[PDB]
């Protein structure tokens, strides 16, 4: 069993910049979700080897996790807020695609996603 390489967190060929919206995504959104009691499964890529999920990366072809997002934000990898919001949405959707309704991990994702929605509702206007 083998895990894929993780999503990239640096790439000099990718355009990037800082925006006040990306700063909010780090200081408000990511921080809020990261500290939540249910954050831990999402703080790093799914280790399909150790979790004994050999089909995970056969169903989930665009993996994402908050460890990756955190590094992307800290590294100023993004060009805009939409790219980062998309990464969060990918992470949640992957969990729902792979798992079953009512599963613990789905309940965890739903709790995080509720907080994500509450925070992105107040994304600031771009300066
Ligand atoms: C470090 C990680 S990452 C992650 C997980 C863990 C531990 C876990 C997880 C499960 C329960 C709770 Cl309380 C917390 C997390 N779920 C996997 C899916 C999975 O193991 N299915 C088979 C199965 C069999 C029996 C019982 C439950 N699931 C998963 N899917 N997306 C993410 C992210 N995970």
Structure-determination technique: X-ray
Which pair of structure tokens corresponds to residue 44? 């790093």
User: Which residue ranges have their beta carbon within 6 Å of ligand 1?
Assistant: 41-42, 46, 51, 53, 95, 98-99, 104-105
Give the residue, by CA position, lying nearest to ligand 1 atom 2: 41
Contact between 66 and 48 (Cβ < 8 Å): no
Contact 49, 2 (CB under 8 A): yes
Closest CA to 77 of 125, 5, 120, 18: 18
Domain boundaries, the chain: 19-123
Assign 3-class secondary structure to the chain. Answer: CCCCCCCCCCCCCCCCCCCHHHHHHHHHHHHHHHHCCCCHHHCCCCCCCCCCCCCHHHHCCCCCCHHHHHHHHHCCCCCCHHHHHHHHHHHHHHHHHHCCCCCHHHHHHHHHHHHHHHHHCCCCCCC
Can you tell me which residue has the tokens 């990511």? Answer: 30
């Amino acid at each position: 069993s083998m895990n894929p390489p993780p999503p990239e967190t640096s790439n000099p060929n990718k355009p990037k910049r800082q925006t006040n919206q990306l700063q909010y995504l780090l200081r408000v959104v990511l921080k809020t979700l990261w500290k939540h009691q249910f954050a831990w499964p999402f703080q790093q890529p799914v280790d399909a080897v150790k979790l004994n999920l050999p089909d995970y990366y056969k169903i989930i072809k665009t993996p994402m996790d908050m460890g990756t997002i955190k590094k992307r934000l800290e590294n100023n990898y993004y060009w805009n807020a939409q790219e980062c919001i998309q990464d969060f949405n990918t992470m949640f959707t992957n969990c729902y695609i792979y798992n079953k309704p009512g599963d613990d991990i789905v309940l965890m994702a739903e709790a995080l996603e509720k907080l994500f929605l509450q925070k992105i509702n107040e994304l600031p206007t771009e300066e």
